[PDB]
Structure formats: structure tokens, C-alpha cells
Design a protein around this ligand. Structure first.
Ligand SMILES: *C/C=C1/C(=C/c2[nH]c(/C=C3[NH+]=C(/C=C4\NC(=O)C(C=C)=C4C)C(C)=C\3CCC(=O)O)c(CCC(=O)O)c2C)NC(=O)[C@H]1C
Ligand SMILES: *C/C=C1/C(=C/c2[nH]c(/C=C3[NH+]=C(/C=C4\NC(=O)C(C=C)=C4C)C(C)=C\3CCC(=O)O)c(CCC(=O)O)c2C)NC(=O)[C@H]1C
Lengths: 315, 313
């Protein structure tokens, strides 16, 4: 039965059990994963409102100094570019990316998107023809099976992940591993099926709009935003569009129990519906840098197109 | 059918026989790169472009005996695996060579039956592609998508004019969006007859998705031999971007005052929906890595055109 979200934990909401999976408000956890930092800022003035508690250690500045400046002063070269790329009223799915040379922290990748009157800024550390070669190989795959196999093998070669699977949704939202590339010694998931509640309905809706999510370390504690609520609204900060957003504790426990230290998946979206997932696993924690993740994002789109094409060749 | 090419004493093309120019087998290439053909098994260099000596820095005869194994040691096994016998002519493999004579070359290979076609071009060596991808996806409708696409391509390439050229059901073309330098004629809104892009050219554009003329006044460079030794027949060059552009079309571009021309096919439901079409007033060799960006954009636009057309119908 579909039911509306509970309030999050920090607003006195209940703790999540196998009874109430579909009601955890996974988009507003009030916290991020510790391998990057996040700031929120007023979309018109550029006043800095919220920051992750670890921000001082990524950005090399005291909180009170950060919060006491506008983005115009903090990001003089990027602030006008942000404002042109992310105009008021734009969708929350639109992202702008730049690379910064920050004194204390080396090269940072900056990813920005806009939710209403809020700008959300994510900072992460950042670092030949493999993509072009893959694009052509995907297109020349003769059928859906060969496409799925080429796609899994390519992603594994690009990333070094222990396991890469193509997980396909059935009409009842149960899913099935239909191809996989895996490290020697791992047991096969190929052909196994899993119940629809393994990925609940409010996750599947979110995964149709925001096409890549990840858990870099399934044992890492989440880092709170400070303050936790958006001071504009005294309400929760929407983090559905932020890759840094904390994974749900239910899902992290599901993964630890499987022996997984790192997770990533790309949505494959066909005709406006979530067709399936490029889901990857690593046994140890593992951070895939932003520019490599971009390659996977591009492959997500290519695969969406090629899945349509291969399936049309099939009636 | 097709007329024989000129160099096999076929008729010269006119506006009476537009549909029968054998544009895939011109026997020549554009001079900003070099092309070798080679045997699929032996790696034996069978044809070369008369200009190969320039790019490769090799005494002419040296090449036309040697083997790819010898000539490209690191690459030759990769090719063997990347382009297995029986693969499609559409499948391409690329690498960057740090080659003694020329700082860096791009190498592009595909296979047509028993022949490997190798293309060499100068090359080199950020977020504009990722930023463009998200911009295309958040365009609210087909019109805005067209506008974003043309603007994005112009910004990435510096081309004087970028258009989105959409085919009607009878192959009548319409310019539905345009991004252009100040002080050019506007082709926005204009329609053009199907015969400007003739049927045999449209078919080839459905399979091989990027072509160009780098300089509309440059002479083609012959293949030597012109005929493939294997077959004593013309080498199919339609999957080669270095393939000499039909003089009928280079004349159409000179009469427009265009010095440089590139286009990317937008393919939807197995059919040619449209073209990203680019003009430059002067000669312009777009480097391979930037062309790759446009090739990606072509696929992304193909996806988004279907998405956007579905939310009208
Ligand atoms: C009471 C709730 C439960 C629950 C919740 C849940 N699941 C997700 C998202 C995912 N679940 C996945 C499950 C699988 N991983 C596999 O490898 C296989 C099969 C071999 C399955 C079935 C996957 C892949 C995802 C997607 C994300 C990822 O790549 O890890 C969420 C949302 C998490 C978030 O975005 O923060 C939630 C809340 N799963 C259950 O089994 C029950 C107990
Ligand atoms: C007797 C045949 C003629 C003919 C042949 C022909 N046309 C092409 C390819 C193209 N024609 C194009 C025409 C236009 N470009 C524009 O900007 C506009 C409108 C403003 C039109 C109508 C285009 C865009 C192409 C695609 C190639 C490109 O990107 O430049 C070919 C094929 C050439 C080749 O690939 O080798 C041929 C043989 N064109 C005519 O107009 C008649 C006289």
C-alpha cells in the first residue's frame, strides 16, 4: 500500500522497520557522506546558509568565516557562470559542474544545482578513447543480451568494481540480474530475482529523475548539515539531487550484510520509466572520482537509447 | 543503381543524375589527413594516399610493402580484437599514437569485409559536455531543445553557423533552429528540396553519422592504387571521415560562401530525423577529440528528440 512520507528522524519521525520501508523520506536525511562537503546558498543574494560539519576541512576555512561571506566573494569566477547556467525556476535535475583550484585542498570538483530559491554546492576532490570505443561497440551489439554483456564488461573495465550487474525491472517492480561481470571467486547473481520491496517505490521514483547515486563506504557515519533545517523555510533541505546525500540506514545495513563496502548504480530510463539499473559493488570502500563518474553517466544515456533500439528489434 | 565512378570512365554528374553519383567510392581523401588500407589477416598495406609520406614521415615504397605488425606493434593486436572478421563497417576503433615524425596522431580504423581502413590525423594532449548534456535534458520542449543544441555546438566549436535541419516526410528539409555569428544571412525558417541531400547520401548518413568538408577549395588526394588489389574494385570509403566530398556538394558550399562544413546525423526509430549542420566561412579542421564530443551529442540529441516528441504526441 502506498502511503505518504514520515517526517525525518530529526523532526521526531519514527525509526524505520521492514513494516514501513516505503515511507522513509530518503531525500531529506539532513546529512551527507564524508568524502565531500556541501554548502547551501540563497539563490539571489548568494548568502551561505547551511554547510556540512566537515566543510572547514575541505575548504580550509572556519565556519563563521564561510557563513559570513556571499558566493560572489567566495567564488568570484564561478558565481556569474552559476547564475547564467541555473536560472530561477529551472528544474532541480539540471546540474552545472566546474573544476576549482583551491589553495588548501588541491583540485576540487564543484557540482551545483538549484532547488527553488536554494543553490546546493557539492565539493569533492578530483584527479583515453575508451568511451568512444565503447560507444561504437554498444551500438554494434547484435541483440539485447550481447548489449547487456558488453555494457557490464565495459563498466567493470573502466571502474575496477568487483561486481557490475545489469538489473532489470519487471512490470511488478521485481528485478532480475540479466547480465553481470564479476571478479574471480565471487558467486554469480545472474538469473536471480528479488522482490519489489528490495527497492521501494519512493526510491524508484527518485531514481527516474536523478540518475546516479552511490554509497562510497557502507560503514561511514553521515555528516550533518549545520544548521539541519534550511533557515529560509525552517524546513528540511531537499537533497534528492545531491550525490553526496546520505544513503538510507536500511539500505546500508542491507549492503553490509551482503559484504559490500561500496555501491553505485546508474538508472536506465526508457519511455519515461525506470527500465533497470547499472548496479556495481566493491568489497572494500571505494571512491570513484567525479570525472570517471561522468563517463558512467554518459553510458547510462547511451544504454537507454540502445535498449530502446534493441527492444524495437523484437516484437 | 549507381553510375561507375569517374576514374572507371563513368558519366560526370549533373543536376540530371544527382541520385546516382557514387559518393562512397571516390578513390580519394581530403588532404588534412592520410589513409592506408590493409589486409585483415596479414596486416599488409595494400593502398595508401599519395600524401602518406608527409604525415607518416616514411619513404614512399617502405609503406606499401610493410605490415601493420611491423608498422604499429602495440596497436596491431588491439585492432585484431576490436574489429573481428564479420563485424559491421560502422564499428570503429580509435587510438592516439606518439609517432616520431608527428608529435601525436589520431588513428581511426574500421573494417569492410577483408580490408582494414586506417585514418591518420594530427591530434593533441572539460565539463562543457556534461553541462550540455544536463541542459539538453532540462529543455522543456522540442523548440527549446533545438535552440540549446545549436547554441551548445556553436560554443564548443566556434563554427560560424550551426543549424538544426529537420527532414519532412518527403525529405523536404527545414531549418528549425540556428546559432550564428553576427553578420551572416539567417537560414532560420527556410525550407529546401529533398534533392539537395539526395537519396543515396541520406541512406549513407543513416549508418555513418558524421561527415565533413574541411576546406571547400582543397583538391582531393588519390589512393594508390585506386582499386583494391584484393578485389580489383573500388575501396568503400563511406565509413571514412577523410573521404573526398562530392564536387557537386563542394560546389553547392562554395556558391553559398562556405569554406568549411560539418554535420551530425540525428537518427530516431532507425530513420534519419535531422542533422546538426555547421558552416564556417573559412577552412577549418576540427580536431578528432572535439569531433568525438559532437558524436556524443548526436546520440544524446537522438534520445532527447524522441523523449520530447513523445510529450507532444
Ligand atoms: C525496509 C527497506 C528495505 C530496502 C530499502 C532501500 N533500497 C534502496 C535502494 C536499492 N536497493 C538495492 C537492492 C539490491 N542490491 C543488489 O545488489 C540486489 C540484488 C543482487 C538488490 C535487490 C539497490 C541496488 C538499490 C539502489 C542503490 C544502490 O546501488 O545501492 C533504498 C534507497 C537508498 C538511497 O538512495 O539512499 C532503500 C531505502 N531494501 C530492502 O531489502 C528492505 C529491507
Ligand atoms: C546533383 C545533386 C546535388 C547535391 C548533392 C549532394 N548533397 C550532399 C549533401 C548535403 N547537402 C546539403 C545541403 C544543404 N546545406 C545547407 O546548409 C542547406 C540549407 C541552408 C542545404 C539544402 C547538406 C547539409 C549536406 C550534408 C553534408 C554537409 O554536412 O555539408 C551530397 C553528399 C556529399 C558527401 O557527403 O560527400 C551530395 C552528393 N546537392 C544539391 O544541392 C544538388 C545540386
Amino acid at each position: 500500500d502506498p502511503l505518504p512520507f514520515f517526517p525525518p528522524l530529526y523532526l521526531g519521525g519514527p525509526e524505520i522497520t521492514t513494516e514501513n520501508c516505503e515511507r522513509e523520506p530518503i531525500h531529506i536525511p539532513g546529512s551527507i557522506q564524508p568524502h565531500g562537503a556541501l554548502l547551501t546558498a540563497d539563490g539571489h543574494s548568494g548568502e551561505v546558509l547551511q554547510m556540512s560539519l566537515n566543510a572547514a576541512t575541505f575548504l580550509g576555512q572556519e565556519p563563521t568565516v564561510l557563513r559570513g561571506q556571499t558566493l560572489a566573494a567566495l567564488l568570484p569566477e564561478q558565481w556569474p557562470a552559476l547564475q547564467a547556467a541555473l536560472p530561477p525556476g529551472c528544474p532541480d535535475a539540471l546540474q552545472y559542474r566546474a573544476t576549482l583550484d583551491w589553495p588548501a585542498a588541491g583540485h576540487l570538483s564543484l557540482t551545483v544545482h538549484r532547488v527553488g530559491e536554494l543553490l546546493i554546492l557539492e565539493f569533492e576532490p578530483t584527479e583515453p578513447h575508451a568511451l568512444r570505443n565503447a560507444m561504437f561497440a554498444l551500438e554494434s551489439a547484435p541483440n539485447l543480451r550481447a548489449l547487456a554483456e558488453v555494457a557490464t564488461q565495459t563498466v567493470r573495465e573502466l571502474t575496477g568494481f568487483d561486481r557490475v550487474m545489469l538489473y532489470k525491472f519487471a512490470p511488478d517492480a521485481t528485478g532480475e540480474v540479466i547480465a553481470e561481470a564479476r571478479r574471480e571467486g565471487l558467486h554469480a547473481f545472474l538469473g536471480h530475482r528479488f522482490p519489489a520491496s528490495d527497492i521501494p517505490a519512493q526510491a524508484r521514483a527518485l531514481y527516474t529523475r536523478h540518475l546516479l547515486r552511490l554509497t562510497a563506504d557502507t560503514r561511514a557515519a553521515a555528516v550533518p548539515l549545520d544548521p539541519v533545517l534550511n533557515p529560509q523555510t525552517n524546513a528540511p533541505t531537499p537533497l534528492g539531487g545531491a550525490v553526496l546525500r546520505a544513503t538510507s540506514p536500511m539500505h546500508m545495513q542491507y549492503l553490509r550484510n551482503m559484504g559490500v563496502g561500496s555501491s553505485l548504480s546508474v538508472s536506465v530510463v526508457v519511455g519515461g520509466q525506470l527500465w533497470g539499473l547499472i548496479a556495481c559493488h566493491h568489497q572494500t570502500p571505494y571512491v570513484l572520482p567525479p570525472d570517471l563518474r561522468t563517463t558512467l553517466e554518459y553510458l547510462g544515456r547511451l544504454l537507454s537509447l540502445q535498449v530502446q533500439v534493441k527492444e524495437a528489434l523484437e516484437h
